[model samples]
Target: GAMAPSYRVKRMDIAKNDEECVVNAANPRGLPGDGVCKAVYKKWPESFKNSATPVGTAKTVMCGTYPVIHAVGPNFSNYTESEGDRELAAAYREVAKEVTRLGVNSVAIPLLSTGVYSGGKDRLTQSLNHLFTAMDSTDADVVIYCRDKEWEKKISEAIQMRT
Candidate 1:
């Protein structure tokens, strides 16, 4: 049966715009004035939210373009908080929707939970499924860009098996 390809998953670096979509794993307040921010703003002027200060560590913001930058929790990698994984998972879902709403056909995202939540296959699966659960086929295409083959395979398998 066809469960419907709710989203697409792959792996790549955020700084590299080699893919059809670019996902910037960023800090809300890290550097919004220049570099990626400036480039993104220039290409998609409406994407900028005109935010003087970042909303939160684990927040997702739109810069007018379909490129949705979902900022993971500041200390999600601490491994001491039980809520880190859940929070990051929530953030991923947020990014998915925001990307879709921005009128972008596809979205490029990273493993938000893995970096800080110590999340591997299990956590990645959890977050992906969670996002897909609310996903609509008519919405934007979803792509999970990993940094390595390991992540690529893991994300691919998850998306394939619907696990």
Candidate 2:
């Protein structure tokens, strides 16, 4: 049920993207927060308190209008470049794998760890590199939701390099 990977990067909201599944930049504790999490966490079931899933892992949930891939990326403030790079790579790779595992054709994901998690523009660019590379193995047509215009432009340019 998988094919070649397709990528889309844009100045868009993950909540507004009409994909079969959307990823949440979740935490191990699964507490409520602003931005992406705040926009969608209320859609989660009451039983969905995530304590077992640590950073670099992911799982899918059936919530609201569609399924969500809850991915816990590393908090850059708390991790070294070596540590965070591995976790961030695994996180995005796992998200792509989940799409194929769930047999979904399309999925949207926010740039993980880019906000309050303190994945600075430096790491954000690295995240995109890892994401596009991991996506190469899956059939899912992935939409990478971005909020910043400059970063959005960077992402678009990066996609060109990858393609």
Candidate 3:
């Protein structure tokens, strides 16, 4: 199996790119209090901090050619919730479709539920499966960025198994 020619999964810091729209795994209330979302929110306080977007929603705001997106999914605290994984997959699908619809060529996303949700490797792999499965025929060049070896390994294995 091979990944869609338009997609790329990598273990990197998700470098800021001028032509890329970054995707943030946000809560249903658009609160970016942890993980990469926190970092993005910290940097773009005015643009992202006060948003009123709902869950299962996708919102984008400019960030110097690297517009940041809030892909609202499920809510989780202490990793007890079970809906976060599926919601994350749905969020990824929504963002992918939206980016392609907007004619954006490149986009970057993180493992949605693994951060503050504390949804470990298993959850990460599950999210990858749903996300990749949800993005079957997308045209945008997509990247799944990971920060650690466990995530990198799980994501790579998921890509290998799914593609």
Candidate 4:
């Protein structure tokens, strides 16, 4: 069997991207409140309405015609920066493994927790650190999606230095 290559960083909309699955930056309580969550819910909300998989875990569900892996990342609102970083890393690790478990050969994962999740350059770097390592353990090829150009460059820059 052929091995998967390293993940690629790209600028594109997660909702419109075609992969075997796309990871949803989910709410801890599983509520499709805002941003990507809301958009994914608009596809079909029932399966994602409950079972927010906590800050360090992930759960999979269907949204419209796609398999949405609801990855719950830490909310920095109440958590300390260090704690938040750990939770976010765990979330990515779980999402990576979850995708492998689903038997998908490809997945598009947005940089988790960078929206209202108090994400900045540091957080983005931390996420890429964990994401690259975890995805290395799986067979699935990864597209690290970021629709915003600035972050896309940042992600790409980080990947360049890391590799």
Give the whole-model CA lDDT for all candidates, comma-separated: 0.50, 0.78, 0.66, 0.77
lDDT by residue (tens digit), candidate 2, 73-150: 898989998898899999988887787788888888888878888645466677777777777777778888988888
Q: Judge candidate 2 against the unseen true structure and give its global Cα lDDT, from 0 to 1.
A: 0.78
Worst 10 residues of 2 by lDDT: 43-52
Better of 3 and 4 by lDDT: 4
Residues 60-147, model 3: lDDT tens digits: 7665655677777655553335555556666777777677766766677776666656533446756667677766677666678877
lDDT of 4: 0.77
Using TM-score as the measure, the top candidate is 2
Q: Which candidate, 1 or 2, has the higher lDDT? A: 2
Clashing pairs in 1: 10-144, 10-145, 11-145, 11-146, 12-145, 12-146, 47-63, 47-64, 76-116, 77-116
Q: Residue 55, candidate 2: how far off, in angstroms? A: 0.6
Could you tell me which 10 consecutive residues in candidate 1 have the lowest summed lDDT? Answer: 50-59
- CA RMSD for every model? 5.6, 2.4, 3.7, 2.3
**Runs off by more than 4 Å, candidate 2:** 1-5, 42-52, 119-121
Clash count of each predicted structure: 10, 0, 0, 1
Q: How close is candidate 3 to the true structure, as a TM-score?
A: 0.77
Assess the local accuracy of residue 22 in candidate 3 as a C-alpha lDDT between 0 and 100.
77
lDDT of 4 by residue, 1-163 (tens): 1164556777866777667888888888878678877777776576674656778899988655567898888888767889988898889889977887788878888777777887443467777787887787787878888767788888888777857
Q: Which of candidates 1 and 3 reaches a greater lDDT?
A: 3
* TM-score of each model, paired residue for residue: 0.60, 0.87, 0.77, 0.86
* lDDT (C-alpha) at residue 72 in model 3: 75
